[PDB]
């Protein structure tokens, strides 16, 4: 037959790939960076505390001005905050209370959100009659929407539990591009700083780099033992970090096409929920299930500081674009700003 | 520029007072998640609740018993994996687990799903209301005597109907032993884990039953009572 011969040639390719991967592993990142000086103890403190949410927070995203931010709670709300003064700028009620993600358009004109309704809803904050209302609403997914991020005010990429990601044209409401190939539920995506590529971490313990304009998967990275829960890009664009349920963070490089470094401790046995780099990429912040956030030195794999301020699982995080502060959302219905 | 500070302050005030009314409404709605295998009846119970009492097959139903509001939701439009969207329901008041008690071979699937829900790290405190549905079909199969329980659960051969059993008037002891055996297989799991943070309340429903509401009301009340007890260590 032919299915078993394609399965065999598949395994042959997988071993040629493993050999081509061990071929470029001439050194390790730790040996190269062993002579650098450590970042030192990093003790950030809560500068603001943002209250108001009636349920567990699931997503947050700073704006480009690094001042406003949106947070999504399971009371059916999406609150926009002026993080400097802790005032609430908007409180958007949702037709479905099971929201799971939220993004902030780089123009500050739109917020997005979606969840178990399998629908991505875009809301125009700069409406002309007075009050924020629904502007677009994207249907087509057969699974729950786990993450979404704007490219511009008219293009938006979504990740869903039907094991697919999709690039949408908000006006026509059509999926202008579909990304398939993941086996498990896609949990997180992160767009490259130039909108040109984006990576995705799925529940099949794999991350995939996708070409936005062509709809093809360029590179697939593995190494995690369990579900990948969070992902982000290195500020340079040629590296990215992943966090998974096996209580480990891993730094992969795009051009070398294999894992570079692993961040773990034998006293942390909980599933990583969120990851994000600092402005310079020297610090990697990760949110754990044990209610804490660990700040790792992205070059030496040593753990440097902790942000112990939540009383329940930290569900999300994000660093400002100016690097001035990091926010952490948890299932206690509170957001906390750190710097 | 102080004017913009006052405009932000009064936008925050209108927001906070809308959020206060929303807090009272959300605080007074009792969310109930309906879970269970298919061919069991989740949708039929939501529909029959929407027929008699009222509400908004659709994921949700909203009904009131004695001035107490409930919102019951069954998720229909997902895949078959549930290890990640299940955590969207860690704060529900109770999970209504529906099990086709008359389907002798998909019963192991229901037991395994109940075990995975009961020992979930994020659902450790969510109590489950067990609906052993389709009792009329179970009586049909037991009286027919064509498919016997011993072929799927050999323990059933040595099982004795409990001395605390309350059969309805006119029930064959074989039917009592079959439905109380399914009852005890799920109670053996719920008490095998325990820890007193949550409990399982079995109820032998048929979906078209009029009282399903009352049973949920009575049990949500018991769950809150026991939560308040275990809070003051009185339990």
């Amino acid at each position: 037959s032919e299915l078993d011969q394609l399965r065999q040639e598949a395994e042959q390719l997988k071993n040629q790939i493993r050999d081509a991967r061990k071929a470029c592993a001439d050194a390790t990142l730790s040996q190269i960076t062993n002579n650098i000086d450590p970042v030192g103890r990093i003790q950030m403190r809560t500068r603001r505390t943002l209250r108001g949410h009636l349920a567990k927070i699931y997503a947050m995203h700073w704006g480009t001005d690094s001042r406003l931010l949106v947070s999504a709670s399971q009371d059916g709300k999406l609150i926009i905050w002026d993080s400097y003064t802790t005032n609430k700028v908007h409180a958007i009620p949702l037709r479905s209370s099971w929201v799971m993600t939220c993004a902030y358009a780089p123009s500050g004109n739109y917020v997005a959100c979606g969840g178990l309704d399998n629908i991505c809803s875009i809301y125009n904050l700069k409406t002309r009659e007075g009050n924020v209302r629904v502007s677009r609403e994207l249907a087509g997914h057969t699974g729950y929407l786990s993450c979404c991020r704007f490219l511009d005010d008219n293009q938006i990429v979504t990740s869903s539990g039907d094991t697919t990601c999709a690039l949408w044209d908000i006006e026509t409401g059509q999926q202008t591009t579909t990304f398939t190939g993941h086996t498990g539920d896609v949990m997180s995506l992160s767009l490259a700083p130039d909108t040109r590529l984006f990576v995705s971490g799925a529940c099949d313990a794999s991350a995939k780099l996708w070409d936005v304009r062509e709809g093809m998967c360029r590179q697939t990275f593995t190494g995690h033992e369990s579900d990948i829960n969070a992902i982000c890009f290195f500020p340079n664009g040629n590296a990215f970090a992943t966090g998974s349920d096996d209580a480990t963070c891993r730094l992969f490089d795009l051009r070398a096409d294999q894992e570079l470094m692993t961040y773990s401790h034998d006293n942390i046995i909980c599933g990583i929920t969120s990851v994000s780099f600092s402005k310079s990429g020297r610090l990697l912040l990760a949110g754990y299930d044990d209610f804490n956030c660990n700040v790792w030195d992205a070059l030496k794999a040593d753990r440097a500081g902790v942000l112990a301020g939540h009383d329940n699982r930290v569900s999300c995080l994000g660093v400002t674009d100016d690097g001035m502060a990091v926010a952490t959302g948890s299932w206690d219905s509170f957001l906390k700003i750190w710097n | 520029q102080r004017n913009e500070e006052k405009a932000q302050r009064e936008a925050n005030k209108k927001i906070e007072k809308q959020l206060q009314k929303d807090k009272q409404v959300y605080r007074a709605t009792h969310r109930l998640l309906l879970l269970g295998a298919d061919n069991s009846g989740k949708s039929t119970i939501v529909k029959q609740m929407r027929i008699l009492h009222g509400g908004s097959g659709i994921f949700e139903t909203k009904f009131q018993v004695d001035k107490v509001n409930f919102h019951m939701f069954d998720v229909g439009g997902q895949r078959d994996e549930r290890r990640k969207w299940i955590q969207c329901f860690n704060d529900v008041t109770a999970i209504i687990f529906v099990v086709d008690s008359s389907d002798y071979n998909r019963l192991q699937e229901a037991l395994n799903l109940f075990k995975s829900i009961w020992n979930n790290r994020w659902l450790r405190t969510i109590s489950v209301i067990l609906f052993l549905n389709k009792q009329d079909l179970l009586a049909e199969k037991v009286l027919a005597g064509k498919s016997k329980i011993e072929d799927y659960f050999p323990e059933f051969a040595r099982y004795t109907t409990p001395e605390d059993a309350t059969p309805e008037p006119g029930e064959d002891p074989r039917v009592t032993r079959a439905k109380y055996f399914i009852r005890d297989e799920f109670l053996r799991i719920s008490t095998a884990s325990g820890d007193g943070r949550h409990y399982c309340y079995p109820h032998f429903t048929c979906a078209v039953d009029t009282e399903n509401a009352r049973r949920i009301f009575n049990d949500c009340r018991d769950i809150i009572q026991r939560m308040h007890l275990r809070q003051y260590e009185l339990l």
Partner: nanobody
Amino acid sequence: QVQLQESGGGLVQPGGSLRLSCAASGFTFSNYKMNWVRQAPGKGLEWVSDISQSGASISYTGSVKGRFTISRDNAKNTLYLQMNSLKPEDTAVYYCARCPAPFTRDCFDVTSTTYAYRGQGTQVTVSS
């Protein structure tokens, strides 16, 4: 990359015997609860037996209770389902599934079509 390879299992007359060896590569074997999920021809996935993180607590589906055993060896990084007294209905593919999270007791791995942490299967056939 997590990958699970099962082996053993062929045409065996009723009342015979077999031993299915599932070798795991790509993770830490000790942390994960392991299961044996079988699929008979023409029916959905069925769950056969599970063994805990260290062989402490074992459990079986009713139909295979008292016939099969399941042993875990973390040293050689494998687990074995020793089947004896096979019936004409034990003919099925036998995937060796791993629960998707370490250090826990729950899993959801009998999924209808696609689960990412189970092997490929060894079609065990039993007929006269």
